[PDB]
Write a structure and sequence with these properties.
The complex is a heterotetramer, with two copies of chain A and two copies of chain B. By secondary structure, chain A is mainly alpha-helical. Chain A contains nine helices and no strands. In chain A, helix 2 packs across helix 8. The longest helix of chain A is centred in the C-terminal third of the chain and has 19 residues. Chain B is mostly helical. Chain B has a single domain, classed as Globins (Globin-like, Orthogonal Bundle), CATH 1.10.490.10. The chains are: A mainly alpha, B mainly alpha. Bound molecules: protoporphyrin IX containing FE (HEM) (4 copies). It is classed as oxygen binding.
Chain lengths: 146, 142, 142, 146
């Protein structure tokens, strides 16, 4: 990936105003409801069989906050995203066995939750830069898969 | 496939947000052309394909009228959307890989405009419905 | 969706190649585990998941018995494959993104074994059928 | 992409024994039948409305041979595939407007036609190396898209 100064400014502005404690839990809980086969990785997180369940679970919340902060390494050096996630890619493949199509599913939930937070400020140009960033991170998370 | 629960959830969401059908379509199409520029070629015969275009606004009303038709025909999307499938496959020759792109843009727009109504439960049923809409629009392709 | 033409083409192809069902399944599963190693974890409870395994051979007979069941149930794959959808979604928890992988491996194997019968016309209808099989297996996932 | 010596040997052996004049026409005609919306790019190639039509068209044949020879640049320097297709990616995007999902569709038809030619010699390890090569070329053809 190649980045324009305008894209860099948009990504920086999004992260500077992100309430991780709000977006992170919402994005992961939304993924667990919309793509519920992703629940099988967090079966020890406590009670989960329903959506009120999933939404309020503090384990899911703490983990969604961890995922969103896992984007920080990428946004702080977007020219090296491919090499910034090597260890995370290895962990999700070999230790956690997360199927790689799932990174894109969570990515789309992060975008949909940020869109609900930003409202009309989530312009097309904002969506384009943010989705280009998340796609770079999703590619890097799938990099160590065989 | 759509369950009775999914159908009721889609009808109840459209009952709430359909008032803004035109605006949803303008914004979804606008986003699709900007974020997925491979799609612009399909609209290039219009006199204006730039942001704010009255052609994009007019076509956005038609696109969400197709979604409203799909909500009415939710029990049998193949038969309900057959003419629109023929139009996109034969008259327009829109590559069918693009349907999922517009579906994602529609979800993003609804999220921006109706954050309270567009809960995760509304989203799972609407996403299953838009997958069914894409498969019905794919009917005449092969 | 499958037309009468697609259904007849799938039945006529299976009528010719079904004699080798067991071999097709062993080879398709073998290929899937080697070429798409993310899938091996799902079979790791077996005592042997290496090339030539008698467990892969025994399971390949079952997989193509599921395809033969889908040919019989081709007029209504949702109802015909419901129990297999429940098994993969709930008892096995196989990520549904993997169905298209096995479908591709099945097409490759049939091509290697039946190059004369597996014409482009046989292939378009079988690919539409395997897409319908994947969607029916996805029924109990969400 | 990273390549093992065994993968390099398999790819080299496949190309050394490839009958381009057979596989190329078959692979493209198969794609035009299985994914018939790809026919719209070759509407000047002559008569095409049916499969006997598509299969026997000499224009489709000559073009399938050109596509298969378009893999040669990649197989001759697999460590530089990403930069070996830049001009081809630009042509398919900006001049031809080929939608990018279509490269994967043709790729799968090339694999299925080679599998029919090679028969039992198309082993799992052979399929794995060949599909890894085609995926690298498909990624490079989509590189210049926006
Ligand atoms: C694509 C966006 C993703 C990002 C940036 C990401 C980030 C991370 C982070 C930073 C960790 C913690 C690192 C550690 O354990 O040392 C982690 C762990 C984890 N992630 Fe992801 N992840 C993503 C997607 C996914 C998805 C799609 C799944 C499953 C559907 C998943 C499942 C897990 C699980 C099972 C763990 C460990 C949970 C535990 O500790 O119990 N991740 N992820
Ligand atoms: C949710 C999926 C979609 C729906 C419901 C939909 C609906 C419609 C409808 C209702 C029309 C009007 C047909 C008429 O004139 O009677 C139409 C036309 C059209 N659609 Fe779509 N469409 C969808 C996706 C797409 C996509 C993904 C593209 C291209 C990327 C596309 C390109 C067009 C074009 C080019 C026209 C004709 C515009 C003109 O008349 O100038 N459509 N669509
Ligand atoms: C064409 C698509 C598929 C068909 C028709 C199919 C068919 C079947 C059938 C008939 C069984 C036996 C169920 C029983 O025990 O009654 C089964 C079991 C199983 N399938 Fe599939 N399957 C498909 C795809 C997949 C995929 C893609 C995977 C994983 C990547 C998978 C993993 C398994 C596992 C792990 C079992 C249980 C094995 C055991 O009992 O030890 N299946 N499948
Ligand atoms: C992914 C594998 C592909 C390879 C390696 C490839 C290779 C090439 C080659 C080498 C050329 C000729 C270069 C030139 O014009 O100077 C070409 C042109 C062309 N390709 Fe591709 N191509 C591929 C996929 C596709 C697909 C998927 C489509 C459409 C569905 C497509 C449509 C075309 C067309 C329309 C032309 C020009 C035809 C003409 O001259 O009338 N290509 N391709």
């Amino acid at each position: 990936v190649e980045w324009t100064d305008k894209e860099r400014s948009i990504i920086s502005d999004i992260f500077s105003h992100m309430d991780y404690d709000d977006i992170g839990p919402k994005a992961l809980s939304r993924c667990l409801v919309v793509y519920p086969w992703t629940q099988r990785y967090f079966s020890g997180f406590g009670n989960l069989y329903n959506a009120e369940g999933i939404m309020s679970n503090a384990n899911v919340a703490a983990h969604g906050i961890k995922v969103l902060h896992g984007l920080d390494r990428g946004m702080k050096n977007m020219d090296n995203i491919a090499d910034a996630y090597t260890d995370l890619s290895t962990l999700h493949s070999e230790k956690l066995h997360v199927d790689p199509d799932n990174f894109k599913l969570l990515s789309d939930c992060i975008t949909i939750v940020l869109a609900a937070k930003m409202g009309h400020a989530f312009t097309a140009e904002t969506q384009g830069a943010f989705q280009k960033f998340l796609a770079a991170v999703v590619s890097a998370l799938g990099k160590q898969y065989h | 496939s759509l369950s009775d629960k999914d159908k009721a959830a889609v009808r109840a969401l459209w009952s709430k947000i359909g008032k803004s059908s035109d605006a949803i379509g303008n914004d979804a199409l606008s986003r699709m052309i900007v974020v997925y520029p491979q799609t612009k070629i399909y609209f290039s015969h219009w006199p204006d394909v730039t942001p704010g275009s009255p052609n994009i606004k007019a076509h956005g009303k038609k696109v969400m009228g197709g979604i409203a038709l799909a909500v009415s025909k939710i029990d049998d999307l193949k038969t309900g959307l057959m003419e629109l499938s023929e139009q996109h496959a034969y008259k327009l020759r829109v590559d069918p890989s693009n349907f999922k792109i517009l579906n994602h843009c529609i979800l993003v727009v609804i999220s921006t405009m109706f954050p309270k109504e567009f809960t995760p439960e509304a989203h799972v049923s609407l996403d299953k419905f838009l997958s069914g809409v894409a498969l019905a629009l794919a009917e005449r392709y092969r």
